[PDB]
């Protein structure tokens, strides 16, 4: 297995530097994932900007917002596209957190992403060849 916590941390750190923010916290996998999420981001750019504006992120709504969106995303199953959208969505929440002067939310979202990966996505990811199979498919 690849360490999903490390995959979350590297991706979130990457996304925040894309916005000019600097967040203190296998390389082929990290690069392939960031490329797929970037592609997805650019493909649906206007949609994600509109989502951002409706997020209404506060410390009291963030946890439930993350959980409800992610449970809907995977409601009837998992595939690699939904895994990419999951990283995109978590990244959008982290960006909104720093943009709204709630940068401590970033650390919480990263943990919620890591926890969802390990609690709900690990079996599917492993059953389907692990992150190496993602690299082979998106490469």
């Amino acid at each position: 297995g690849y360490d999903n916590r490390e995959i979350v941390m590297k991706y979130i750190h990457y996304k925040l530097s894309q916005r000019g923010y600097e967040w203190d916290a296998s390389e082929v996998v990290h690069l392939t994932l960031r490329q797929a999420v970037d592609d997805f981001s650019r493909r649906y750019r206007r949609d994600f900007a509109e989502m951002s504006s409706q997020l209404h992120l506060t410390p009291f709504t963030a946890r439930g917002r993350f959980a409800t969106v992610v449970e809907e995303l995977f409601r009837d199953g998992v595939n690699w596209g939904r895994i990419v959208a999951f990283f995109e969505f978590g990244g959008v929440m982290c960006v909104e957190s720093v943009n709204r002067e709630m940068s401590p939310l970033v650390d919480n979202i990263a943990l919620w992403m890591t926890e969802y990966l390990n609690r709900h996505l690990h079996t599917w990811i492993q059953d389907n060849g692990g992150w190496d199979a993602f690299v082979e498919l998106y490469g």
Partner: peptide, 21 residues
């Protein structure tokens, strides 16, 4: 409510995106 709409749209886009691999 807002979250259920976000999730459905995300799901729509994911399944489109996965097909483009």
């Amino acid at each position: 409510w807002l979250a259920q709409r976000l999730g459905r749209e995300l799901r729509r886009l994911s399944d489109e995106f996965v097909d483009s691999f």
